[PDB]
Structures are given as structure tokens and as C-alpha cells.
A paper describes a structure:
MINDY1 and MINDY2 are members of the MINDY family of deubiquitinases (DUBs) that have exquisite specificity for cleaving K48-polyUb, yet we have a poor understanding of their catalytic mechanism. Here, we analyze the crystal structures of MINDY1 and MINDY2 alone and in complex with monoUb, di-, and penta-K48-polyUb, identifying 5 distinct Ub binding sites in the catalytic domain that explain how these DUBs sense both Ub chain length and linkage type to cleave K48-polyUb chains. The activity of MINDY1/2 is inhibited by the Cys-loop, and we find that substrate interaction relieves autoinhibition to activate these DUBs. We also find that MINDY1/2 use a non-canonical catalytic triad composed of Cys-His-Thr.
Based on these observations, we predict that P138 modulates the dynamics of the Cys loop, as it provides rigidity to the loop by anchoring itself into the hydrophobic pocket. Hence, the mutation of P138 to alanine should dislodge the hydrophobic pocket interactions and result in a more dynamic, flexible loop. To test this possibility, we determined the crystal structures of the MINDY1 P138A mutant on its own and in complex with K48-Ub2. As hypothesized, the absence of P138 results in a less-extensive engagement with the hydrophobic pocket, resulting in a more mobile Cys loop, as suggested by higher b-factors of its residues. In contrast to the WT enzyme, the P138A mutant was readily modified by UbPrg, thereby supporting our notion that the P138A mutation makes the Cys loop more flexible to reduce the steric hinderance to Ub binding. Next, we determined enzyme kinetics using fluorescently labeled K48-linked pentaUb, which revealed that MINDY1 P138A mutant is a much more active enzyme with >10-fold higher kcat and ∼3-fold lower Km compared to MINDY1 WT. The consequence of a more flexible loop is also underscored by the ability of MINDY1 P138A to cleave diUb, which MINDY1 WT is unable to cleave. Importantly, increasing Cys loop flexibility and thereby catalytic activity with the P138A mutation does not change the linkage specificity of MINDY1 for K48 chains, as the mutant only cleaves K48 chains and no other linkage type. The P138A mutation, which increases the mobility of the Cys loop not only enables transition to the active conformation but also facilitates Ub binding as evidenced by lower Km for pentaUb and binding to diUb.
Author numbering:
A (entry chain A): 108 to 370
B (entry chain H): 1 to 74
C (entry chain D): 1 to 76
Write the structure that this text describes.
């Protein structure tokens, strides 16, 4: 609970069954929890009924087992060297799930990230990884200044532009800079719209927004994020948080996506 | 700038803050408007807890954002 | 030797170092003053990311030079 290695387990009535989800007390394990909550919700990993507390070690061990059990799609005895490599490098980044997982978003599409071992953890498990940090087409300057650049590339580009003699580059630097300031919470309306259309009905996925990872789903054409903060541990009726705006003004719902209340 | 703080009862608290304000400051402002002691307050934005010692700016909390107020673990 | 580290927010960090110091050392100093983990730090100077195993001297970083600190996107 208070200890970093420990986490409070919340039991919820999910599709006819008492099902566990893991709550978060401190910043750092969001990625681990986002993945494990999917596995728990899918009933792929199962916990003793009325288990209350769970450790990083445990979560890691369950996750390790799941990853190493994945089979290649080609299912061919020959080759498959590329698959084993993926598995190895995913197992190497695994500890980072508990302490803070790095991602490098592309502002072009909801699924666009620089492909890294971090991303491969999600791929192997067949879990989509999404963001909504998309440059709006309506703004031509941002689309050209940002272009196909990743977050990592864009910040260096800004530094260069800041130092450049070429007044066109200076100008581009300032537009890119402006884009990062106004979209600092890492979700744009365009991105939210694009994500709502792209996500699949009933599918569980991981959503990276504002230096956080959430378990996301789509139900009746509407995006929802699993409520994990331990502040809501005792609130059985607060399971899913609606995702229909960028300013955080959400509606809470129960396990079955019905609006809840505490009054 | 203005932010909003929604409780679970449905009540909305309006606050005047600056990006440079710490989470502590914000909790103090909530203690000026409501009866609630800072140490009983736990603030969340976009599903993540806001830790004391960080600023609104640290969490990229811009004007007219909605935060969620719940009760503290410790 | 004294150097400066500018963030994108505009804030500047002063550091006390030696040409022989590794980039890893400098990142450790940045952790001591800001609490940013070394592995989340990317230091930029004269258009290139600074690699951990090289020294300030290797990059020709002399006194009162300004480095730029950018953070990796880490979701906690
Ligand atoms: Cl237990
Ligand atoms: Cl669909
Ligand atoms: Na927007
Ligand atoms: Na699914
Ligand atoms: Na509500
Ligand atoms: Na400068």
C-alpha cells in the first residue's frame, strides 16, 4: 500500500465475475499496471479471491510468464530468429515498467511511436499502444514545422533553430516551440477525435497521456480509461473514466459503463 | 489563471492559481475555500495523482483544467 | 571549471566540473541539484547528443559553455 513494491488490489464485478485490478499510490509503475490490468481484465492472469496486496515482484513474474509463453504468428519450425530477439529485448526493458517507461511519440498518428524495445513489450502481448498527441492539420505551420519528427527529434530541432542564422529556421523553431507549449498535456482535440475512431470496440489497449500510461477501452463508440488511483480503492462504482475532452473534465462510470455517483 | 476541482459528491470548486504554484499551494487554496485540511486532500489529473512538491507546470496543468479531489492515503 | 545547463522552460543550472569529467558525471551532478534521473537526461551541445562514456574535454566543452538539457518522455 504505502511501500513502493506493494500495491492495493481492487475487486470489481467485470462481465459476471469478481475480477482484480491494481491501484497506483505513487508515480513510476503506470506502464506495469496498464499492461497487468489488461491481462487481469482478460482473465489471462488470475489471483486468489480476496487477495488485497500484491508486489512488483509478483506482477513482474506473472508478466514474465505471459511474454515467454507467446508463440510466433508464422508458427513455422524454420527461422523465427527475429521473434526470439524481440522476446529477449522485451525481457530486458521489463524492469522499467515499474520505475518509468520511456516512449518517443510521433505527432502524425495515434499509433505512431519510434519503434523501440519498450514498444515491443506491448506488440508481443498483442496490446495496442496509443497516444493522442497529434498536430492538427487545420494548422499548416505546425504540420510543416513538426513534420514526421518524433518528440526526441523535435526538441533538438528547436535548439538548432534557436541558434540558426536562417530566419526561416528561427521561425520554424518558434512554431514548434509554440506547439509543445500549448499541447503540453500531450492530448489534442484532433488526437482525441482520431483516437476515438481508430480504437476498436471492446478492445483493451494502453494509452500514453501526460507522462502516464492508462488502460483504455472503447464502449459504444466512446473512449474510457481504467481508474487506478488508490484514492478510489473503496469506490466500487468508480471503475471507468470517460475520455471525451482534453481538459480533464470527465464522467465516472461503474464496471459496465453506467454513470455512477456518491450522492 | 482558473482551474476547477471536482469532488465525488458532484461539487465543483473554482480556484485562482499560477503555473508556478506547488500542489501544496493549491491544497492550501482548497482549505481557504472549503473546510478541508491539506493533509486529507489527494489531487488527481487525467488519472494520475499530483504529488506535493511539484508544480502545476510540472504536470502540464493549463487554464480551465479539471482536477479531481479525493481523500488521502497518507 | 563552471558550466551552464539550460532547460526548455528557460531555467538555468550552474555546475562545477573539470574537463576530465565524464558526461555520466555531469548527469549525476544534475541529479544532485534537480532530482532528474541520469537515464532520463539527454544533454545537447553544438548539435550533438553527448554520450555517457566521453569527457567534457572530448567535446571541447570549456568554461562557461552552455549545454541544453532535454528529458525523455517517461510516464510514471
Ligand atoms: Cl493478501
Ligand atoms: Cl470499431
Ligand atoms: Na487542442
Ligand atoms: Na481486448
Ligand atoms: Na460524474
Ligand atoms: Na541559449
Amino acid at each position: 500500500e504505502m511501500e513502493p513494491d506493494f500495491y492495493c488490489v481492487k475487486w470489481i464485478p467485470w462481465k459476471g465475475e469478481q475480477t482484480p485490478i491494481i491501484t497506483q499510490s505513487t508515480n513510476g509503475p503506470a506502464a506495469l499496471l496498464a499492461i497487468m490490468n489488461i491481462l487481469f481484465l482478460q482473465w489471462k492472469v488470475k489471483l486468489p479471491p480476496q487477495k488485497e496486496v500484491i508486489t512488483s515482484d509478483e506482477l513482474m513474474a506473472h508478466l514474465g510468464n505471459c511474454l515467454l509463453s507467446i508463440k510466433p504468428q508464422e508458427k513455422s519450425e524454420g527461422l523465427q530468429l527475429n521473434f526470439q530477439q524481440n522476446v529477449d529485448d522485451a525481457m530486458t526493458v521489463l524492469p522499467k515498467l515499474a520505475t518509468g517507461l520511456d516512449v518517443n511519440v510521433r505527432f502524425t498518428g495515434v499509433s505512431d511511436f519510434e519503434y523501440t524495445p519498450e514498444c515491443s513489450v506491448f506488440d508481443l502481448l498483442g496490446i495496442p499502444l496509443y497516444h493522442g498527441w497529434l498536430v492538427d492539420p487545420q494548422s499548416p505551420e505546425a504540420v510543416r514545422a513538426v513534420g514526421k519528427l518524433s518528440y526526441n527529434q523535435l526538441v533538438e530541432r528547436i535548439i538548432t533553430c534557436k541558434h540558426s542564422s536562417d530566419t526561416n529556421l528561427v521561425t520554424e523553431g518558434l512554431i514548434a516551440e509554440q506547439f509543445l507549449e500549448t499541447t503540453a498535456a500531450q492530448l489534442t482535440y484532433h488526437g482525441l477525435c482520431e483516437l476515438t475512431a481508430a480504437a476498436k470496440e471492446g478492445e483493451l489497449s494502453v494509452f500514453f497521456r501526460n507522462n502516464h500510461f492508462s488502460t483504455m477501452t472503447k464502449h459504444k463508440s466512446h473512449l474510457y480509461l481504467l481508474v487506478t488511483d488508490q484514492g478510489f480503492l473503496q469506490e466500487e462504482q468508480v471503475v471507468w473514466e470517460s475520455l471525451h475532452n482534453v481538459d480533464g473534465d470527465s464522467c465516472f462510470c461503474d464496471s459496465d459503463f453506467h454513470l455512477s455517483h456518491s450522492l | 489563471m482558473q482551474i476547477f476541482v471536482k469532488t465525488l459528491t458532484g461539487k465543483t470548486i473554482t480556484l485562482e492559481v499560477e503555473p508556478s504554484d506547488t500542489i501544496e499551494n493549491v491544497k492550501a487554496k482548497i482549505q481557504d475555500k472549503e473546510g478541508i485540511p491539506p493533509d486529507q486532500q489527494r489531487l488527481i489529473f487525467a488519472g494520475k495523482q499530483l504529488e506535493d512538491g511539484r508544480t502545476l507546470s510540472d504536470y502540464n496543468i493549463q487554464k480551465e483544467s479539471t482536477l479531481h479531489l479525493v481523500l488521502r492515503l497518507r
